[PDB]
Amino acid sequence: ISEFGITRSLIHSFDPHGKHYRPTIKPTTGFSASADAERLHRSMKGPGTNELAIINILARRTNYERQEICQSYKSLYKQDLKDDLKSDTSGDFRKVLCQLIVDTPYMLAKSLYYAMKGLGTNDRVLIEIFTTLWNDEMKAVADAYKQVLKDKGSEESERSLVTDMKKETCGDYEYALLSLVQAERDDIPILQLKAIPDKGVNSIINHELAEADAKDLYASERRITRVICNRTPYQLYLTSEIYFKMYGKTLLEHIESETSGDYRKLLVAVLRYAIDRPSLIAEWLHDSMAGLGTKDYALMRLLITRSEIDLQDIMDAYESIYGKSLLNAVKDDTSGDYRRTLCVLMGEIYN
Amino acid sequence: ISEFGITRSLIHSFDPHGKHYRPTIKPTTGFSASADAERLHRSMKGPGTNELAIINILARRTNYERQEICQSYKSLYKQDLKDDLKSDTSGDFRKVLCQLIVDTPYMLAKSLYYAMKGLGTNDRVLIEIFTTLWNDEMKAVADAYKQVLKDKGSEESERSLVTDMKKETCGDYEYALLSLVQAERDDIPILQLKAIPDKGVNSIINHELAEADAKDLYAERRITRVICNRTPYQLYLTSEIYFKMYGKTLLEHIESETSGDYRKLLVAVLRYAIDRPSLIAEWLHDSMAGLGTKDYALMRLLITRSEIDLQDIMDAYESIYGKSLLNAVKDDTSGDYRRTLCVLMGEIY
Ligand SMILES: [Ca+2]
Ligand SMILES: [Ca+2]
Ligand SMILES: [Ca+2]
Ligand SMILES: [Ca+2]
Ligand SMILES: [Ca+2]
Ligand SMILES: [Ca+2]
Ligand SMILES: [Ca+2]
Ligand SMILES: [Ca+2]
Ligand SMILES: [Ca+2]
Ligand SMILES: [Ca+2]
Ligand SMILES: [Ca+2]
Ligand SMILES: [Ca+2]
Ligand SMILES: [Ca+2]
């Protein structure tokens, strides 16, 4: 099973105008957990390893499918897939595989953990991860966090994700983070979400609310935090439009001149997640590759997660923004089976 | 007078190898406060304004000289230079003039004020200003800050720079910030500083200390203590020892070891010691990236750096970006505002 369910929340699956985002990985038809499990086990037989075999499976499956496979191979072999892969591979390739065979929420929880363990605080990572989680997902990550602490020899009974953040963070930025982590953003019931393709988004937004919020903001303090962080992407988009109609300045522009530092970065990320997502995440990717190695984790984490949501859309944005395919940028920044893996997540298959 | 003295601390004046940094503005020989003050006053006569007149004086003077001008004008005319300039100019040119005729510490204090006032925290500005102050200067800035609060209708008796930062800041970053603001970095007596040209910097550094520090770092306020408290000279040596001992640079180590604003600050303090011209060159570039603004960071940096190492920064910029700083600035700015920036860089009209 997966603490994230068969899919990521549907709330991530539609652009502002209600159109479906395009992923690079969809649920497999005929998906056989056992079949893939057997195929993986086979591929580790012998003194060496069939990297490509392994890649063509794991990087062509969803988190849920991957998890089913883990669960399958664990009973079909009384062995631990995570362990068997770790001992059959190494270097950058092993890293990516570990990121891949871990249930998404635990994956994120670990990176949150490393973002805060250490001197200083990797705000960029907190902003990047938290921006992309909705209430239920946020809760599963917080649970998984507790497990990471246990997993890393923490005898501290009461230590929690919020515990770590509070100590780690302060000011407007802290408040805004805690809000997201509090997991109390406006919800849209699964039924309403599912019906978006049919009834549109007019169905799940509110012009009265959007107007009030716009007027509220222009008068700008938890006011901006409340609107930007709580409103659904769909609600936020509408609020953005109304705000420009009413004031002739965009909500983005407004947020930028009115806020500073990490607080600003967070707000802008949350807003853009709603109204300019493809470009937002494209830039994040670009930034994970800027200079050298190494923001390897951000790169893996983004490709792995976004692949089952909107990676294709992000890819198109990337090429149109930077003049080069995401594929090529990735190819130029990485190598080995690690590179191959990233390419397959993007949809490029080999052998 | 100036709360910063006739000059910035000499501790800013020499590169790691003891070589003098090159400014674009040096103390004027024959400098006559009154003469300049009369020339400025004449320049504002009539319904209009002789901008260039004003520019070629104020952007051609040190903070100290500018401040003596202010003080001269105030008695030679029973008028207020700041005010007279403000009412005779507007837009971006007025902005720059205001930044120019303010005593340096007050100017920085105002910026630190704006970096913290508002939602969030302009950390970039905190890092940029604090990185460039030494103990005495830091103290003058904190006193100027108290005045800025008064100046802005604050009846709060005990409110202070430290006060505002603590509220504004947390974690390893806060602690490092407070150290610098606490103004408790290793000092180098004026005598010892002045003697650098003669005795070198071997005189004012310590290999034993540097070695212990490198060993200490390779193994938490340990990093803060070394990066923030050591003089640029000591830090440079510690940098080199560290690479000999470990085969990785101190910078590389700091970067893999620390995250976020804490990292940013450490890196900036280190680079201010070992890679300064590039550091500030990139800061300048950043102030121009995208659009207008960060107009304040640009004028703050050119105005302050001009009397210390702006020429060295210019050379770095050209070699890093392939364009002269002068042309980058020319391309991003306009009007008497642009002309002013150009003159600080040494281009006369
Ligand atoms: Ca094997
Ligand atoms: Ca092989
Ligand atoms: Ca930390
Ligand atoms: Ca706190
Ligand atoms: Ca911050
Ligand atoms: Ca790279
Ligand atoms: Ca790389
Ligand atoms: Ca006039
Ligand atoms: Ca603030
Ligand atoms: Ca504090
Ligand atoms: Ca920070
Ligand atoms: Ca620009
Ligand atoms: Ca401009």
Q: Helices A171-181 and A223-230: crossing angle, nearest 10°?
A: 30
As a whole number of Å, the CA-based R_g of chain B is 21
As a whole number of Å, the CA-based R_g of chain A is 21
A220: nearest CA partner in chain B: B119
Of A185, A258, A179, nearest to A218 (Cα)? A258
Show the beta-strand stretches assigned E in chain B.
119-120, 258-259
Of A254, A173, A257, A260, nearest to B121 (Cα)? A260
Check whether residue A219 and residue A161 sit in a common domain. no
Q: Could you tell me the two tokens for B284?
A: 């300048």
Provide CB contacts within 8 A for B45, sequence distance 6+: none
Q: Do A168 and B171 touch (CB under 8 A)?
A: yes
Contact A213, A205 (CB under 8 A): no
Q: Assess if residue B24 is contained within a domain.
A: no
Three-state secondary structure call for residue B77: coil
d(CA B221, CA B41): 53
* Exp. method: X-ray
Check whether residue A311 and residue A250 sit in a common domain. no
Query: What is the DSSP pairing of strand B258-259 with strand A259-260?
Result: unpaired
Residue span of the structural domain in which B301 resides: 276-347
Q: Assess if residue B5 is contained within a domain.
A: no
Q: Assess if residue B3 is contained within a domain.
A: no
Q: Could you tell me the two tokens for B155?
A: 């009846």
Q: B28 and chain A: CB distance < 8 Å anywhere?
A: no
B183: enclosing H helix or E strand: none
Check whether residue A261 and residue A306 sit in a common domain. no
DSSP state of B186: P
Check whether residue B197 and residue B139 sit in a common domain. no
B221: nearest CA partner in chain A: A119
A346 labeled part of a ligand binding site: no
Q: Could you tell me the two tokens for A272?
A: 């853009």
If one counts every other C-beta atom within 10 angstroms of the C-beta of residue A146, the result is: 16
Q: Could you tell me the two tokens for B137?
A: 């200067």
Q: B121 and chain A: CB distance < 8 Å anywhere?
A: yes
Q: Assess if residue A322 is contained within a domain.
A: yes
Check whether residue A126 and residue A138 sit in a common domain. yes
The resolution, in angstroms to one decimal, equals: 2.5
Map tokens 């004027």 to a residue: B28
Q: Assess if residue A111 is contained within a domain.
A: yes
How many structural domains compose chain B? 4
Residue B110: C-alpha distances to residues A95, B3, B147, B224 (Å): 48, 15, 9, 26
Last residue of a domain, one of A140, A167, A184: A184
Q: Could you tell me the two tokens for B303?
A: 């105005």
Check whether residue A271 and residue A292 sit in a common domain. no
In chain A, breaks (C-N over 2.5 A) are found after 220
Last residue of a domain, one of B75, B102, B129: B102
Q: Assess if residue B209 is contained within a domain.
A: yes
B222: nearest CA partner in chain A: A119
Residue A160: C-alpha distances to residues A138, B37, B85, B194, B202 (Å): 13, 64, 57, 55, 51
Check whether residue A59 and residue A78 sit in a common domain. yes
Last residue of a domain, one of B131, B157, B184: B184
Find chain A residues with C-beta within 8 A of B118's C-beta: 258-260
Check whether residue A194 and residue A268 sit in a common domain. yes
Q: Helices A123-131 and B260-274: crossing angle, nearest 10°?
A: 150
d(CA B339, CA B56): 9
The helix, strand and coil proportions of chain B, stated in percent and rounded to the nearest 5, come to 70, 0, 30
Check whether residue B317 and residue B253 sit in a common domain. no
Q: A292 and chain B: CB distance < 8 Å anywhere?
A: no
Task: Look at the alpha carbons of B271, B273, B279, B284 in this order and tell me if their dihedral is positive or negative.
Answer: positive
Map tokens 């100017």 to a residue: B107
Task: Look at the alpha carbons of B323, B326, B331, B333 in this order and tell me if their dihedral is positive or negative.
Answer: positive
Map tokens 């969809």 to a residue: A26
d(CA B183, CA B110): 19
The CATH number assigned to the domain holding B42 equals: 1.10.220.10
Of A289, A293, A277, nearest to A327 (Cα)? A289
d(CA A194, CA A223): 30
Find chain B residues with C-beta within 8 A of A115's C-beta: 259
B319-324, Cβ contacts within 8 angstroms, sequence gap of 24 or more:
B320/B278, B320/B281, B320/B282, B320/B285, B321/B281, B321/B285
Check whether residue A269 and residue A242 sit in a common domain. yes
d(CA B322, CA A270): 36
SS (HEC) of chain A: CCCCCCCCCHHHCECCCCCECCCCCCCCCCCCHHHHHHHHHHCCCCCCCCHHHHHHHHCCCCHHHHHHHHHHHHHHCCCCHHHHHHHHCCHHHHHHHHHHHCCHHHHHHHHHHHHHCCEECCHHHHHHHHHCCCHHHHHHHHHHHHHHHHHCCCCCCCCCHHHHHHHHCCHHHHHHHHHHHCCCCCCCCHHHHHCHHHHCCHHHCCHHHHHHHHHHHHCCCCHHHHHHHHCCHHHHHHHHHHHHHHHCCCHHHHHHHHEEHHHHHHHHHHHHHHHCHHHHHHHHHHHHHCCCCCCHHHHHHHHHHHCCCCHHHHHHHHHHHHCCCHHHHHHHHCCHHHHHHHHHHCCCCCC
DSSP state of B345: T
Q: Assess if residue B6 is contained within a domain.
A: no
Check whether residue A195 and residue A267 sit in a common domain. yes
Q: Assess if residue A286 is contained within a domain.
A: yes
Map tokens 């470990």 to a residue: B246
Q: What is the dihedral of CA B135, B169, A252, A226, to 10 degrees?
A: -160
**Shortest CB distance from B119 goes to which of A123, A170, A224?**
A224
Check whether residue A228 and residue A177 sit in a common domain. no
Task: Look at the alpha carbons of A128, A129, A135, A137 in this order and tell me if their dihedral is positive or negative.
Answer: positive
